[PDB]
Structures are given as structure tokens and as C-alpha cells.
Design a protein around this ligand. Structure first.
Ligand SMILES: Cc1ncc(COP(=O)(O)O)c(/C=N/[C@@H](CC(=O)c2ccccc2N)C(=O)O)c1O
Ligand SMILES: Cc1ncc(COP(=O)(O)O)c(CN)c1O
Ligand SMILES: O=C(O)c1cc(O)c2ccccc2n1
Lengths: 423, 423
């Protein structure tokens, strides 16, 4: 254990780490733990999509999916995800291949036009616009707010959601706070799922801004690492009962169900928000790709079809997550320099190494050929005040590559730890 | 000859037309000439896309199209349209199913961020922003500028392009004019193709705004109604020789080549404009749908494959355009109340009836069950100052429906003419 270590014991331990690191570099590795994309083996599960939908190009309504028209998306596919998400079909639309693009356009519409009940477009707010950002969180959420000039306020994540006490306090006195980024199930990468009590408070709390929005990015809605699927909290129902029906914007995607970048996105909200979004989305496109929505409807068949498909993903992913946890445990637990999540779903593991050493750890790994996500990536402005957090993405590499990559990463974290202790 | 006539005879002809209109009212019609979309017969030409790409999900470069990554689009598909458009592959990207969406986002980026060489974002221009709009023009272009609060200035269309003399005088002295909408080949709905000399002048003219842009929406680039395809003028090359390389934004689409709403879009520009667009598009999406780009590349094979496919469209469309022309000629020519285009390509015929009667003509047709595009639809703010222009969309209906609909429209146009003449 490294808080109990003598001065000689630390110098010798640092020396052993130096040899481990020397040995590691001599292996000339070329490994990568940085992107959360499905493995080829996962993608193969959806290869039937590559020959679908075949000659019958009509959906169950009789719609010719090959021709212009229809902003809402195919109702038959929406009905499947309506069940999975617990959102009524009229409150859910299906888009193109990117939920991020839906999230981006909603922010852009808010800047240029204002939301459905905004006093003015957000670009006209002379004191600027703020979003609350539970951390660790999703760097592509932060990039959207950063690029639009929206200030980001980081919020600690707790076991069953973010720090709602803190959130409630900020929004009570600051009318400039217009939004909050969330991934409310198996968060990227905390792995935290918001409890019902957390959700109830977030949709009931009084906000100084009358048009405050929850960006409810349910990217991992069905993405279990066990054989159970999580119950979806009824965020839209709770918000309406609280008198804030327009507050949540719900997003989902099949990027990690079928093809990453070749899937279908979803947006859910109040009827007022659906009409608001479609009014402005109609200036941008005649409508989404109905053929790809038809392929997905034919492939899935129904919601049980999606569930069955997700357990097939789970059987591939779960051993990779178990391996990462075991390796971190065997290399790091005794030193007590680190801690990590053991998620029940989602695509990431969040590792905290010794404070003050995360950047160094990442740099050490890069010079032995192990690519590790940049330090601070899960924080707005890439600013991790403790310089401790590293994201690990287990999905893509083979099991043997994953073992080599995480064992090397652990070697780098230990040497970085002894380096800082000696100073 | 209506305009030279004899008052009881004018009254008698009006009585004649009324009998024609009563007859039309009997036939209990339900017809529609408003839909600029491919017929089901045209869409059938591309039904093999519904089973593509099949088992081989890799492009020629080995890219797994089922997984994340890559903003430019598949190089093999870009190479086909690079040849068709005369734009080098690095200067052309392929998007999702909507070129309109590319145009919208570029305008949105210009408002929020400014273009690559703008002095400031357009939303920071205290005197506002204007676009030049050749008329008749594309209403969805006008909807983008209208929704963004960009003032539109209509420009008369002439035989070989818009009124370049007028355009040159406006842009030289007004720094608020930032852009011009164009459809430079087979314009929607004028059918006018910009001449080589016109293109040359538009890319050389001095503009008061240093970041003036030509929105070069080449929607109908290969969409001939004869057995020959137009030359593509090298707008990007000519602009670069003029010292204005950033001036043109080129757009294209397969919406009327393969599936309308299920095709692939394209954006072309200087290397600076490509990098500028992708920088901000990268905040919106991880990237476009490579699998649909793969289906199109596999379906088309090469540029000659696209050309032959377009000739298959021409065989379906040309008799429909010929029928409309034949009916208008036989019913309206003697009266001299009207004139219409005879386009060599594109999707529309532009009809001018007697000035002051277009709104009435449309109402009369609707009241006998013939839906006709509303007066002013091809003008910014829906303002046709002469109340004469009607757009005809020949592509969608069957030959018998097209014949009945255009013949009905003529009766309404004739009846509307005699009404105003007696008044
Ligand atoms: C919470 C949340 N919301 C939306 C999305 C995007 O989903 P859409 O495809 O529908 O737009 C995500 C996805 N995250 C992944 C994927 C990712 O970034 C990535 C980026 C570049 C190259 C490869 C990649 N694998 C990651 O963080 O690595 C996400 O976690
Ligand atoms: C001139 C023009 N530009 C753009 C578009 C939009 O095409 P897309 O389907 O690629 O958005 C159309 C529709 N045919 C059009 O006529
Ligand atoms: O939904 C539509 O029917 C629609 C909308 C458009 O902008 C079109 C443009 C060109 C051609 C057909 C079009 N059709």
C-alpha cells in the first residue's frame, strides 16, 4: 500500500516500475483503448441489415419509403422504441444516423430562435448562457456547448445521479442557466444510472430560467451488461405532472444496436416540443431516411427483437468488462492508488489514478504504444481539477489486446504514482 | 386572340369558358400538379438498392462502413460525382440524404461562426444580412434565409442566367449582401441554365462584402430531358482564377437519381471551405452514413453508370413534359394570354398566365379538384408582383391524370382571363 511505504521501499518500488516500463516498451505494442465503438464481432450481429428491406419498400401504413415526405419517421419503428423508452408514439420521432446531430440542432435552434416558450432566442441574452455538466461526462456534449459559446458548470456525480442539491441551488438563483447535459442510464462514462428520485427532483425543481431544459441523452437505454434491462423512468410524465412538460428533451440511437453511424436516431418530448422541433427541422430537410428506418423495422420486428439483440451484444461485451476489472484489481488494488467503476451497462469504465498523475499516465502509455483517452476528456474544457480520471473503452479490441492494453496502462499508472510520491 | 377582341364576343367567350368550367366541375376530379417528386416508376429503376450492399460491407479502400469514423464520405462514391460535377475529390464531400440540410447548416454556421474569411459572424452584423434571389426560384432556399432573418432581394431571371448587370450593381455597394441562391443548371422552376459567360461574371464581380458566397445548388446537374447531359462549368476553378476561391458553395444530390429522401448529398468547395465546414459539422455528427454511400457506389459503379441511369429517367419524364407542352399549346396558344417554358432538363415547367389572374386560376382549379401550386410560391415571401406565375410539376402523375390536370388548369386559366378582361 502506497501511503504506508517507507522511503527506501518507495525508491526500490519506483525502480521495479522502471523495469516493468522498460520491458513494456520493448514489446513495441500498438494498442488502443480510446474509442467506444462496437467490435466487428458485434457489428456482424446486424449483417442481415445489409440485404434489407428487399423488394417490399412499403411500411405497414402503405408508405412508399423511397419517396419524399414525412417528418416524424416510420410509426412502426417508433412504436418499438416508444415501448423501450416508455414514451408515447406521438411524442417520439425517428431521425437519421446521428442523435448527436439532433442534440446539436436543438441547441442551435435555441440559440437562433429560442425554445418553444423562451422569452427570446438565447443568442440575444446579453449575460450569456450556461449549461450544467455532471462530470465525468460525454466530451461531445461539451463540444456542442463550447462551440456555441455556452459556459459550462461542472457538477459532481453521485452514486444514483448528479448532485441535485447543488443543481437545485444554482438554477434557483441564476436565470442564465438554460440547460443540463445528462446521460441518465449507464452514463458515459460514470456508468451511473439516474434513480427515480433523482429524476423526479430534476423535473420538479424550480428554475430561475423559465425555459430550462434537461438534455436527456438516453444513449444507453437498453445497453445492459447483465441479462436484465433497466426500467425507464417516465421523465416526460413526471415533468408534465410537475407543470414543466417542456423541460426534457429525450434522445436515443441505434448506433450501438445495429451499425455505428448507419443506425437511426430518436428524439422525444412534449407535444409542444415535437411541433417546435419539426417546425425548424422542416427548414433544414424535407425529412429523414425512411428506407433505413424500414430496414431497422424489418430487422428488429418488435421490442422483444431489440431485447434479444441486446443480449447478443451483452454476451460479447460482458467478458471484456470483466477482464478490465480483473486486471485493474490484480495490478492496482493493493497499491490503493486508484479506483474504478464496475458498470452494469454502457460502454465505458471510469478509472481514477493517483491525483496529479493522470496526464503523466496517459503520456507514459503513449510512448509504449498504448493509446489512452486524453486526460480531462470527460470534463468541460478538458479540465480535470484533480488530474486523476482516465476513461477506458473496452468494446473494440480483442480480449488478448484488451488484457495487454490494460495491464500496460496499470504499469504506467503505478510508475507515475511512484514518480509523484518521490516529489 | 383574347387581347384584341369584341365586347359581346368577349362576353360570349366568357360564357363559353363558364360552360367549360361547369363541365370540369362535373368530372369529380382529384388531381395534383404540385409534387416535384419522382414517380413510383422512376423509383423502381433503383430498387436494387433495397438489397445492397449485401455481405461485402467494405469499400474499395477496406473501410468497414458499419462502424464510426470519416467525415468526408467514401472516396469511391465522391470520385463518381467528382467526374460528373468537374470537382476534384478532395474538394467534394458526401453527406446524408439531404443537400438542403447541407445548405441550411452552412447558412447556420455563417450566422453563428462566420465563413472561413468573414470579418465576424453574420449574426453580429448590426445592419443585418441580405441574399440575392433570382426569381422565379426555389421556395425551400427562400425558407432558409427567411427563417434566419436574412432579407431577400429578388432578381429577374433572363434567358441565360439571372440579371448579372443588376446583381453586379447591388453587390458592389452593399456590404450586407452576403449570398446568392442559384440553381445553375435547369433551374427550379425557370429551367434556365447559367451560361459560361454568366458564371464567369458572377465569380469575378467585386462585392462590398469580402465573404460573399454563391450558393451553387446544382440540384439538376445531370437531369436531362434529352439524350445529352449539359456541360458542367468549372465554377470553383474560374472563381480561383478570379482570386475568389472561397466564393462558390457547390451542392448536389441523388434524391432524383436514386431515392428521394434516401439518397446521398454532396458539398463542394475550396479546400479552405471544406475544412471550415467539416470543423463545425464535426460538432454536429461523428459523420455521415457510409453504408448508404456504399450502396450507391455499388449500384452506380462509375460515372457512366449514373449517366445511363439518368437516361432511363429521361425516358419516363420526357413524355410527361411533352404532354404538358402539347396540352398547353392546344388550349392556350390562340388566346395569347400565357407563355410557358420548354425546359431541356429539371423537374418543372414555369407557366405565366394573364397578369393579375394566377391566384384566381389556382382557386378555380382547386374548386374543381385540381391542386395547383399556389401563386407566388416561387418568389421570396411568396410575392409574385405580377400575379401571373404558376409552377407545374409533371413528374409524378400518370399520363391520364397529367392530361386531365393540365387541361383543367387551362380551362381555369382561360376562365380567369375573361373574368379580369371584362372587369
Ligand atoms: C452519450 C452519447 N450520446 C451520443 C453518442 C453518439 O451517438 P450517435 O451515433 O447517435 O450520434 C455517444 C457515442 N459515444 C462514443 C462514440 C464516439 O464518440 C466515437 C467518436 C469517433 C470515432 C469513434 C467513436 N466510437 C464514445 O464516447 O466514444 C454517446 O456516448
Ligand atoms: C434546386 C433544389 N435544391 C435542393 C433540393 C433539395 O434536395 P435534397 O433532397 O438533396 O435535400 C431540391 C429538391 N429537389 C431542389 O429542387
Ligand atoms: O415533399 C415534397 O413533395 C417536396 C419538397 C421539395 O422542396 C421538393 C423540391 C423539388 C422537388 C420536389 C419536392 N418535393
Amino acid at each position: 500500500s502506497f501511503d504506508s511505504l517507507s522511503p527506501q521501499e518507495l525508491a526500490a518500488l519506483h525502480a521495479r516500475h522502471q523495469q516493468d516500463y522498460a520491458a513494456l516498451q520493448g514489446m513495441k505494442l500498438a494498442l488502443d483503448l480510446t474509442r467506444g465503438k462496437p467490435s466487428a464481432e458485434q457489428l456482424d450481429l446486424s449483417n442481415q441489415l445489409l440485404s434489407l428491406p428487399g423488394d417490399d419498400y412499403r411500411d405497414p401504413e402503405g408508405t412508399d419509403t423511397r419517396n419524399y415526405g414525412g417528418q416524424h419517421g416510420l410509426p412502426g419503428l417508433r412504436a418499438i422504441f416508444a415501448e423501450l423508452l416508455g414514451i408515447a408514439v406521438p411524442n417520439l420521432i425517428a431521425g437519421n444516423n446521428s442523435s448527436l446531430e439532433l442534440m446539436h440542432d436543438i441547441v442551435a435552434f435555441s440559440m437562433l430562435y429560442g425554445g418553444v416558450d423562451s422569452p427570446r432566442p438565447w443568442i440575444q441574452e446579453q449575460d450569456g448562457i450556461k449549461f450544467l455538466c455532471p462530470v465525468p461526462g460525454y466530451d461531445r456534449h461539451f463540444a456542442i456547448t463550447e462551440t456555441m459559446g455556452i459556459e459550462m458548470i461542472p457538477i459532481p456525480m453521485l452514486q444514483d445521479g448528479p448532485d441535485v442539491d447543488l443543481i437545485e441551488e444554482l438554477v434557483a438563483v441564476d436565470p442564465a442557466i438554460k440547460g443540463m447535459w445528462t446521460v441518465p442510464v449507464f452514463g458515459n462514462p460514470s456508468g451511473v444510472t439516474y434513480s427515480w428520485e433523482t429524476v423526479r427532483r430534476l423535473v420538479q425543481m424550480r428554475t430561475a430560467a423559465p425555459d430550462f431544459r434537461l438534455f436527456w441523452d438516453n444513449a444507453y437505454a437498453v445497453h445492459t451488461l447483465t441479462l436484465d434491462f433497466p426500467r425507464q423512468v417516465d421523465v416526460l410524465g413526471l415533468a408534465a405532472k410537475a407543470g414543466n412538460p417542456n423541460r426534457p428533451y429525450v434522445f436515443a440511437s441505434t448506433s450501438k444496436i445495429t451499425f455505428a453511424g448507419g443506425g437511426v436516431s430518436f428524439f422525444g418530448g412534449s407535444l409542444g416540443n415535437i411541433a417546435w422541433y419539426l417546425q425548424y427541422a422542416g427548414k433544414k430537410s424535407i425529412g429523414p431516411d425512411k428506407v433505413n428506418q424500414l430496414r431497422h423495422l424489418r430487422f428488429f420486428g418488435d421490442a422483444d427483437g431489440v431485447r434479444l439483440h441486446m443480449l447478443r451484444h451483452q454476451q460479447i461485451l460482458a467478458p471484456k468488462f470483466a477482464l478490465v476489472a480483473e486486471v485493474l484489481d490484480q495490478r492496482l488494488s493493493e497499491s490503493k492508488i486508484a479506483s474504478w467503476t464496475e458498470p452494469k451497462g454502457g460502454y465505458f469504465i471510469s478509472l481514477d489514478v493517483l491525483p496529479g498523475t493522470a496526464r503523466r499516465t496517459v503520456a507514459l502509455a503513449k510512448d509504449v504504444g498504448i493509446a489512452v483517452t486524453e486526460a480531462g476528456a470527460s470534463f468541460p474544457y478538458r479540465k480535470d481539477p484533480d488530474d486523476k480520471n482516465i476513461r477506458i473503452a473496452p468494446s473494440f479490441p480483442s480480449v488478448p489486446d484488451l488484457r495487454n492494453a490494460v495491464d500496460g496502462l496499470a504499469t504506467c499508472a503505478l510508475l507515475a504514482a511512484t514518480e509523484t510520491l518521490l516529489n
